[PDB]
Amino acid sequence: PKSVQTAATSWGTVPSIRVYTANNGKITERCWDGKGWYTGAFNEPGDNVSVTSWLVGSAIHIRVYASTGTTTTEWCWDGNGWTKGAYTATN
Ligand SMILES: OC[C@@]1(O)OC[C@@H](O)[C@@H](O)[C@@H]1O
Ligand SMILES: OC[C@@]1(O)OC[C@@H](O)[C@@H](O)[C@@H]1O
């Protein structure tokens, strides 16, 4: 059977949670900061998604790896918007 594909990350003690869903070639984002789920700003093409995040002090940084075909694109959140990162594959 078919299934959407998700990736999740969280930070802090509230916590904040971000869940990324690849569905029909589009990746969207759902967010929790303790008071209900809502739709996040992230919207990029892809059929597979992974994510990692880390804190520097109180500031979150998120990296989303979106794959279409053999091409993986890294998207970066650093507090002020999503930008394309420097990631490229080995071969
Ligand atoms: O406050 C929500 C938000 O700014 O949190 C950080 C990232 O998850 C963004 O995509 C998202 O819109
Ligand atoms: O632009 C932000 C950046 O430098 O952050 C660290 C890595 O995620 C890099 O690929 C990325 O380009």
Author numbering: 0 to 90
Please quote the paper that reports this structure.
An isomorphous structure was obtained with PK‐RSL containing a Pro‐Lys N‐terminal extension.
Anionic calixarenes are useful mediators of protein assembly. Symmetric and chemically uniform, the macrocycle acts as molecular glue by masking the protein, simplifying the surface features, and providing a homogenous scaffold for controlled oligomerization and crystallization. In this work, we report modular protein – calixarene cocrystallization. Motivated by modular crystal synthesis, we demonstrated the possibility of interchangeable modules in protein – calixarene frameworks by swapping supramolecular synthons.
